[PDB]
Amino acid sequence: MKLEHITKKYGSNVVLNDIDFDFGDSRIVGLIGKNGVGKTTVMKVMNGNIIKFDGKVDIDNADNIGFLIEHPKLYDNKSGLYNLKLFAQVLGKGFDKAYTDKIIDAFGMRPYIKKKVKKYSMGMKQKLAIAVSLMNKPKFLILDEPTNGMDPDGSIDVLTTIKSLVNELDMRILISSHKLEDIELICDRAVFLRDGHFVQDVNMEEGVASDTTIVTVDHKDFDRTEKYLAEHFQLQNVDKADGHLMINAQKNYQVILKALSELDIYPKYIETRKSSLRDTYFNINQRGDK
Amino acid sequence: MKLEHITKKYGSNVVLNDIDFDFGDSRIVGLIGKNGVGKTTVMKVMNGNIIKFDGKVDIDNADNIGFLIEHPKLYDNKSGLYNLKLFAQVLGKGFDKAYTDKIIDAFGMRPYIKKKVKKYSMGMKQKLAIAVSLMNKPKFLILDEPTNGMDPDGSIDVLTTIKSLVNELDMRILISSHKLEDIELICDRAVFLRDGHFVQDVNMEEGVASDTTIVTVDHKDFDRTEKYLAEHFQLQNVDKADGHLMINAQKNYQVILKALSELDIYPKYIETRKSSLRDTYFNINQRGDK
Amino acid sequence: VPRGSHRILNLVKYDLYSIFKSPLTYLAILVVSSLIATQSILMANSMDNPKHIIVYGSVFAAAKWLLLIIGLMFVVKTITRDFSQGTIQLYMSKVKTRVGYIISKTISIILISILFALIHYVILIVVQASSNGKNLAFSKYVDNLWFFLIFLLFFGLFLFLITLASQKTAMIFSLGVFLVLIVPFIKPFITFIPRYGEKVLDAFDYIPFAYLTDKMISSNFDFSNWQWVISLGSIVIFFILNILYVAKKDI
Amino acid sequence: VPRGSHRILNLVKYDLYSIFKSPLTYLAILVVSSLIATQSILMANSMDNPKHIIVYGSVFAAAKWLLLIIGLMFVVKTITRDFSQGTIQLYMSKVKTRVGYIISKTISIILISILFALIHYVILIVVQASSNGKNLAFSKYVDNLWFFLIFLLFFGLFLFLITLASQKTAMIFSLGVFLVLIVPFIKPFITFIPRYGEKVLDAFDYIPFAYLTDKMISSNFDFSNWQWVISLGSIVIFFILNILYVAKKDI
Numbered sequence A, B: 001m002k003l004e005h006i007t008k009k010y011g012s013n014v015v016l017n018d019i020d021f022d023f024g025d026s027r028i029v030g031l032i033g034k035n036g037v038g039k040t041t042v043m044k045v046m047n048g049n050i051i052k053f054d055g056k057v058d059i060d061n062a063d064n065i066g067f068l069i070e071h072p073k074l075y076d077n078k079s080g081l082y083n084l085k086l087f088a089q090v091l092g093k094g095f096d097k098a099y100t101d102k103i104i105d106a107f108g109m110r111p112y113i114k115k116k117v118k119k120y121s122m123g124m125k126q127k128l129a130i131a132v133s134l135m136n137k138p139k140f141l142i143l144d145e146p147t148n149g150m151d152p153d154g155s156i157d158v159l160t161t162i163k164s165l166v167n168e169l170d171m172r173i174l175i176s177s178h179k180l181e182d183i184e185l186i187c188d189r190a191v192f193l194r195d196g197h198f199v200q201d202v203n204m205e206e207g208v209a210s211d212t213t214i215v216t217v218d219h220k221d222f223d224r225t226e227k228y229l230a231e232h233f234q235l236q237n238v239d240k241a242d243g244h245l246m247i248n249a250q251k252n253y254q255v256i257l258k259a260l261s262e263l264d265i266y267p268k269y270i271e272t273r274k275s276s277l278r279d280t281y282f283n284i285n286q287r288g289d290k
Numbered sequence C, D: 001v002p003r004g005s006h007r008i009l010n011l012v013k014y015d016l017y018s019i020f021k022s023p024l025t026y027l028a029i030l031v032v033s034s035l036i037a038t039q040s041i042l043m044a045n046s047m048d049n050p051k052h053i054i055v056y057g058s059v060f061a062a063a064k065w066l067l068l069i070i071g072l073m074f075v076v077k078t079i080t081r082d083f084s085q086g087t088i089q090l091y092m093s094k095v096k097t098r099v100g101y102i103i104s105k106t107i108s109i110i111l112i113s114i115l116f117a118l119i120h121y122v123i124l125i126v127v128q129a130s131s132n133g134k135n136l137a138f139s140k141y142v143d144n145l146w147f148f149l150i151f152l153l154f155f156g157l158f159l160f161l162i163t164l165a166s167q168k169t170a171m172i173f174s175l176g177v178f179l180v181l182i183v184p185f186i187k188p189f190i191t192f193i194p195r196y197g198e199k200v201l202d203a204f205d206y207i208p209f210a211y212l213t214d215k216m217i218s219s220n221f222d223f224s225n226w227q228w229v230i231s232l233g234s235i236v237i238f239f240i241l242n243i244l245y246v247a248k249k250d251i
């Protein structure tokens, strides 16, 4: 899956200018930009509907591709189960009851799997759209705003279910979406699109050096606590007058506070400061917005 | 705009059951709920699209209603200025050039104000729909999920502009949408909908916000942590699935951690944060959701 | 309330602007005028070698049929525009707006018909001015305008009621084309066969679809008293039914 | 690729399933069958008062006419379903699916035409069994099957090309009805008039639209060699043009 040197013009409006893209050792990627910059256009070009690429796209024929773009596509007069079955037989390899049943109970569409799609709401149609897209058993998933009409609990269960199929079946996901607090729950990296070209690629696992975790302890217990932390993990900044020591961000506090509770140390307070994707977006985009 | 004893049903399913509503000393009111519970049905009942609702809606004839429902409806073939002028003549008292110019300048639509609607994107169409709705100069302005396709800065700008409009002119606003962090920005009162009834009515006016503390621990231990904090201190809300326990604001973590140490259970994440309507929404509706 | 009256007039005015602004109207007018002028010049000036005498019955009938069928298609498109774009739910808020909507649609139908009659007048007048022969009469042109009004009004209200009931556009276009062209086509091939043919032929003088569509080919419009009364009564009945259904339908 | 063959066959099977599972298909069959049976009992069994002899040419032509105009509309609906719901974006992804899509649509056209020919055979055979007269021939029914196939296939590919170029659905339904009913309607009222009428009348035997629509209502049909060459060559050219357009369009 590669894209090489893509330029697309609509009349006098230039959308794409020599873009390269590659899935390198990553499974879920995020696409971020402003409104009308051409993200769905990039998605559409990598998918295949547009034909005048003027460049090179490397796709193996044996790999299947499933997608959801701007709007759900379903048969309105017919039921949902008929739609799932038809697109599994027509686009996918076939239909299997166990696989569709696991999808239906995990997604949560059992009470309404037999109602007519015409009576559904928009969020109901978006969930149906994600399930029909996944029915293809694809090698690449191309989703355009999958969570723009769902309740928060619905967003968490659908993303967790998507991740579960990512590990149980070798899958690569490309997701373009706003609401970065929802994207950050399950994603490995994000790429920022601005003015028609890629500018920044951020890997969230490795982090930035600005993240800190602040632990405050008693004055009498300060020497012993500092000794244990100096032995075990890395120290970036140390200031005794405030009593705060800056170390690298750690996700689990279990082992750390377990060790201090074993050494009779009880911290007064603990918290962490980290930079999110909203912060990265504003820092990159303030050059043209602020 | 008032509703009295509204009960609308579709065949055997009943969606709304004998509700009352009134804008009492509040300018912006938010409607929050799950998917398919009857939110658009409520907006259609207020606006007038449904006649067989078997009740009484108290509205005045001298008062006009400008609205936004499920998706924008616009003339794709024609231009944006043509759409604004046409809906200003047909629905409003007339066309005001200075007022329309102010709306365009505040929203930021000047670069694309002369381009065809069929060439717009989703966020552009949604913004145009927000402007056409405010074009009517309404006394009551009602919105069905106003922020479908806009970036964080754009949503912030639109919310600030709507607040400046509802304060310069006497307007009463109803907004029904998810993404509650955007909702808490502009709202005076929130009503919660489950099974056709208004279960809760949370009112927020000033920014005191009732600061609170979050303790996260796994479910099998979450029972003991909830019982302990209810037996010692006063606890406000709990989320069972995520193991989120929200006690009041505590400056010093020492007594909690010491007790949890003789109890031998420990938290994965503990924090202090501003309370929100997202928290209130999960409190009212996880009984039905999970 | 004159405010409501102006709201009606602004809707008819903007519908007229959209019609006068689209390029398909001037492409249709170019094709019809070019075809009518070409057919009249080739057919009248050479098939019998006279001293350039032209009879105007054939041009009258041909221009009437072409302009009527084009105006009908323009009318069906205007009627089904809002249902096509889905903006109708914005115009269906209160009762007074649903009524002003129907009033504006009827007034728009009347204005489009008057405009098309004026157009028919211009093409036939310039053809007569260019050529030589026996000129037609002004009273005939006025009554031709009236016939345009009744035909377009009747079919537009019928198609408006059906499209309100069904909310489907492809059916309206196909039904209008089918209704216009099936009865003149079917009548010669079927009425002369039965022993019930004389009775059914007599009853075709009272079915509004049949005689209104049939008299289109004819170069003169002649109505009996019963025929005129029944046509006017049918339009009034359609208006009352439309008002009643529009004030009880939920969008 | 046999896998692609299975994809096409699954789509044709499901298209046939959606045709066979609708109430309008049986409403149409019941209406056409009731009309034909009512007409035959009322008029063929009592005019000259014979010993209930019936001549089958009029019933043949009438059944052919109703079934052709209904099968044509079922074909237009079938070919326009995907553009109506907008799900066509999911199928026009890669070139191999876009071509298997066109092959599947053609196979669907072939099976719908065959099914309607079988429907014609069953209805007329039951009517013939009930009544009294001289039976028809199987060679007539097989060549009639070929005529159903060629006509329906031709119009469906033409309308498929136009609907591909335009992406509008109302225009296709109107244009289909228009093309079927305008040529037989215009020819008697205009063709016999000129000093060019004989030339145009002779040229009507070479335009595929013209002679297929003229010969649609006839109770007898034998083709000439030139007609066979033009129709088959035209079918091949439309198929090739459809494939070429499908591989270059972007949504």
Ligand SMILES: Nc1ncnc2c1ncn2[C@@H]1O[C@H](COP(=O)(O)OP(=O)(O)O)[C@@H](O)[C@H]1O
Pocket: A010, A013, A035, A036, A037, A038, A039, A040, A041, A042, B118, B119, B120, B121, B122
């Ligand atoms: N018919 C069209 N085809 C392709 N692009 C278009 C068309 N009309 C307008 N555009 C341009 O596409 C740009 C936004 O492209 P798109 O990627 O489709 O949406 P977004 O970037 O909001 O996801 C706009 O600047 C608009 O000018």
Ligand SMILES: Nc1ncnc2c1ncn2[C@@H]1O[C@H](COP(=O)(O)OP(=O)(O)O)[C@@H](O)[C@H]1O
Pocket: A119, A120, A121, A122, B010, B015, B034, B035, B036, B037, B038, B039, B040, B041, B042
């Ligand atoms: N004809 C109908 N149109 C719309 N909704 C319907 C209809 N019949 C039943 N409903 C049900 O009413 C419920 C509420 O729908 P809706 O107002 O669209 O969404 P929400 O309540 O999430 O805003 C839906 O679950 C839907 O199934």
